[PDB]
Amino acid sequence: APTSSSTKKTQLQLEHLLLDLQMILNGINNYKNPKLTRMLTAKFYMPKKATELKHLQCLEEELKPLEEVLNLAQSKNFHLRPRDLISNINVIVLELKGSETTFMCEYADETATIVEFLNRWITFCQSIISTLT
């Protein structure tokens, strides 16, 4: 596959991010319970902006606040034992580059529930690609 030329392997690395995001987060997004009063605990502090691969570093710390809510989504839909797969996507954005940039994940604007982290990284990919060309 054209890798060093980069004309099309950008699409392959792309399928990787959407591969672990859809297989993993599509299952945790199946919470069709009308009683999610105990699920507001998500409190995920999603970043303000996210138009570059730099904000992707927040993924490694987001696994902590999301781990607690994972206990309620642990039975059928989100039964993939390896939840680290999303944290693995963070390891592949670091291997792609994640180069010299001391930038503390600036979260702000307001706190968020579990639907904001979901659409956050899934929409993170589908968006950054629609602006490339």
Write a short abstract of this structure.
With 133 residues, this protein is mainly alpha-helical. The protein is 47% helix and 0% strand.
Explained architecture:
- By secondary structure, the chain is an all-alpha fold.
- The chain has one domain (1-133): Up-down Bundle (Growth Hormone, Chain: A), CATH 1.20.1250.10.
- It is built from 4 helices and no strands.
- The protein has helices at residues 9-28, 58-70, 84-96, 114-130.
- Helix 1 runs antiparallel to helix 3 (84-96) and helix 1 packs antiparallel against helix 4.
- The two termini are 21 Å apart.
- GO terms for molecular function: carbohydrate binding; cytokine activity; glycosphingolipid binding; growth factor activity; interleukin-2 receptor binding; kappa-type opioid receptor binding; kinase activator activity.
- Keywords: Adaptive immunity, Chromosomal rearrangement, Cytokine, Disulfide bond, Glycoprotein, Growth factor, Immunity, Pharmaceutical, Proto-oncogene, Secreted, Signal.
- Belongs to the IL-2 family.
- It is found in: Secreted.
- Disulfide bonds join 58-105.
